[PDB]
Amino acid sequence: SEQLQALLLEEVMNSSTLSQEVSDLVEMIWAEALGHLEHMLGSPNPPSLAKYRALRCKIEHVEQNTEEFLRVRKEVLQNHHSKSPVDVLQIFRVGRVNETTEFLSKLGNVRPLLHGSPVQNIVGILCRGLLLPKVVEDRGVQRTDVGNLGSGIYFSDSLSTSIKYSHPGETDGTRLLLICDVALGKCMDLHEKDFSLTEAPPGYDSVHGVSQTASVTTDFEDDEFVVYKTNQVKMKYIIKFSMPGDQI
Ligand SMILES: Nc1ncnc2c1ncn2[C@@H]1O[C@H](C(=O)N2CCN(CC(=O)Nc3cccc4c3CNC4=O)CC2)[C@@H](O)[C@H]1O
């Protein structure tokens, strides 16, 4: 029958909705997260379409020769201050289901910034977006629960600082960080830590910890940008990269 011939072809057309480079990535971030829970609880390739659909997030490969690739690769390495070599492997356009509509694009000062995260967090981040940390009020607010700015979402403009948070995964030793449009708004510059910040100071939309220099000493080794409402973040790219000074 011809009806049967058409359904088998639609299965082909379904499985092809997933580039090989994107299936391989979805495998790795899933592998990394399963390897991590196995470890704290006791311990080509066929298109793994099932795992990608659960992320409710669209991931496209930008080809390593595209015009888009060389431009984005330039912007990541643009403020690489510690010139310890980095090999930018792959770049993926990204789009969360609800992110493009909830985004507060109308604040102004929308700037593209870097958020690093260990590889096991990537499944969580792609399914739910970048989440605010949980405030602590059952006990004394230690230095282990907050960052240097308070309970917010942290970005930098420098690959040198995002490499401090983009820890290499156990699966392949590659590092991931996101590129996100961040609606900064009115941005208060800070020179001293504040761990009590649950929101931006009055009249401002975000806060910026200013990195120490020989002229101006502050409490910040790195430039830190923090926002306090999740819909000031729109993820735009995943960057797969690797540090040569990781081997041997
Ligand atoms: N949906 C989600 N699924 C999984 N992990 C998720 C998630 N939303 C947020 N996270 C993860 O939670 C973490 C988090 O909030 N916090 C709380 C605040 N943060 C402060 C801090 O030092 N971060 C920090 C500071 C400066 C730069 C950079 C970062 C992280 N990325 C950077 O380039 C420390 C960790 C964060 O590392 C993020 O990767």
Side-chain angles (χ1 to χ4, degrees):
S1 182
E2 293 177 350
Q3 199 182 5
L4 174 83
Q5 169 188 357
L7 296 188
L8 286 174
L9 294 170
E10 302 176 359
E11 230 55 53
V12 179
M13 310 185 33
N14 197 50
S15 158
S16 289
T17 189
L18 190 79
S19 64
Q20 187 75 57
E21 300 87 345
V22 179
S23 166
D24 287 336
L25 174 74
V26 162
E27 273 303 324
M28 194 265 287
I29 61 168
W30 256 72
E32 190 77 21
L34 295 174
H36 198 267
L37 315 201
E38 261 188 2
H39 179 262
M40 77 182 255
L41 306 176
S43 192
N45 222 74
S48 72
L49 191 60
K51 299 190 194 68
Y52 164 73
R53 292 282 186 157
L55 299 175
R56 278 193 297 99
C57 179
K58 178 163 211 57
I59 311 175
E60 307 171 62
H61 190 221
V62 302
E63 265 280 330
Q64 268 73 38
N65 39 73
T66 299
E67 179 62 284
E68 193 182 10
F69 182 102
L70 290 173
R71 184 225 311 148
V72 169
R73 163 184 183 282
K74 185 166 88 73
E75 289 171 353
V76 176
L77 308 167
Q78 185 188 17
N79 321 339
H80 191 35
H81 294 319
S82 70
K83 276 297 192 283
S84 51
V86 174
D87 216 316
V88 173
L89 295 174
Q90 306 186 292
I91 302 180
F92 298 79
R93 192 182 300 114
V94 157
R96 276 189 62 237
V97 177
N98 289 337
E99 219 158 75
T100 59
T101 86
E102 283 150 8
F103 183 61
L104 303 173
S105 55
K106 303 317 165 202
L107 295 174
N109 200 4
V110 175
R111 275 181 62 181
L113 308 168
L114 310 172
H115 179 90
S117 195
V119 179
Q120 72 244 46
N121 285 329
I122 305 299
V123 281
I125 295 172
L126 299 181
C127 179
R128 293 275 290 266
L130 276 168
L131 298 179
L132 299 190
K134 293 182 175 187
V135 290
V136 171
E137 292 157 331
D138 310 276
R139 49 158 175 83
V141 171
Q142 293 169 20
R143 304 192 308 272
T144 82
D145 315 306
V146 296
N148 289 337
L149 271 193
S151 291
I153 312 170
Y154 286 66
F155 301 86
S156 182
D157 70 341
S158 166
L159 171 60
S160 303
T161 59
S162 287
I163 294 169
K164 308 181 190 190
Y165 303 90
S166 282
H167 300 140
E170 290 206 345
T171 293
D172 64 342
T174 53
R175 305 168 108 111
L176 294 180
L177 61 75
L178 298 177
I179 295 173
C180 305
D181 280 339
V182 181
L184 286 175
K186 282 180 196 161
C187 188
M188 168 149 145
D189 288 353
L190 293 177
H191 288 182
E192 41 196 10
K193 293 179 179 179
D194 186 351
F195 300 95
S196 295
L197 282 184
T198 65
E199 72 187 347
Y204 287 87
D205 307 313
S206 73
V207 63
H208 163 59
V210 167
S211 48
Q212 203 174 252
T213 65
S215 297
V216 187
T217 68
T218 59
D219 275 350
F220 296 101
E221 195 200 351
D222 301 311
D223 298 291
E224 283 169 12
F225 290 79
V226 183
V227 309
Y228 297 97
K229 303 325 190 195
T230 48
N231 53 6
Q232 309 183 225
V233 185
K234 186 208 291 178
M235 303 183 317
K236 183 178 179 180
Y237 298 91
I238 302 182
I239 310 289
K240 193 155 107 75
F241 68 103
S242 66
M243 303 276 297
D246 281 358
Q247 315 291 308
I248 283 280

